[PDB]
Design a protein around this ligand. Structure first.
Ligand SMILES: CCCNC(=O)NS(=O)(=O)c1ccc(Cl)cc1
Length: 216
């Protein structure tokens, strides 16, 4: 499990410090990611620290960000200076398919998904995830993350097609044409939610705009 600890409220042009505290027995994946969601906007990848200690950053934010770790305290850190108003958002740390509940901070390549879809219980539905740079392959390690009311995030599929533990068998990840695809076979009412895909581009993640699946 993962748990963010943030100052709640930060002043414009001052700096932001969030601590991600990592607890449990197993550590799936290869490091710890920082992601944020501005209120009412989509998910945005911020950066990652690998288990060897190396870091990658959202290039658009690289100049203001620094990520570190304290292996003795089992924690990973996010620092961002020069806080702007558009920096208001929930901040999540994520390891593989596990997301923390996030902390809300208030300041004092393109991936395209179907924007909306409707289905009926027992019918099968497919969601798609297109890259603007070309075809999607397993080298992109397609992730599918389910946001269920309202800011709780859970990884459904990682590595294009690896079902996360405890995820119902009706969810399967695949490639279809040049897109990544998430198939919900025999959808149920409990699958009404928002589904985000993310694609790996050699040194950074990029999230899609998310799909609102309504189940009648
Ligand atoms: C090896 C090239 C990329 N692979 C990778 O990042 N694997 S990971 O640690 O398990 C991971 C899973 C989901 C997210 Cl969103 C972020 C990281």
């Amino acid at each position: 499990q993962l748990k963010e600890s943030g100052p709640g409220l930060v002043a414009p042009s001052q700096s932001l410090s969030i601590t991600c505290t990592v607890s449990g027995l197993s550590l799936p994946g290869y490091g710890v990611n920082w992601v944020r969601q501005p209120p009412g906007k989509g998910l945005e990848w911020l950066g990652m620290i690998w288990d060897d200690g190396r870091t990658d950053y959202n290039s658009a934010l690289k100049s203001r960000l620094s990520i570190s770790k304290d292996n003795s305290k089992s924690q990973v850190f996010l620092k961002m200076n020069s806080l702007q108003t558009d920096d208001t958002a929930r901040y999540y740390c994520v390891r593989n398919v596990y997301w923390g509940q996030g902390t809300l901070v208030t300041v004092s390549a393109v991936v395209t998904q179907e924007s909306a879809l409707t289905t009926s219980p027992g019918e099968t539905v497919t969601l798609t995830c297109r890259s603007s740079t070309g075809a999607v392959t397993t080298s992109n390690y397609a992730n599918w993350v389910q946001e269920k009311p309202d800011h709780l995030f859970s990884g459904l599929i990682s590595g294009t097609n690896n079902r996360a533990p405890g995820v119902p068998a009706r969810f399967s990840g695949s490639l279809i044409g040049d897109t990544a695809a998430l198939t919900i076979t025999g959808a149920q009412t409990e699958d009404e939610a928002i589904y985000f895909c993310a694609l790996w581009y050699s040194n950074h993640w990029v999230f899609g705009g998310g799909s609102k699946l309504t189940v009648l």
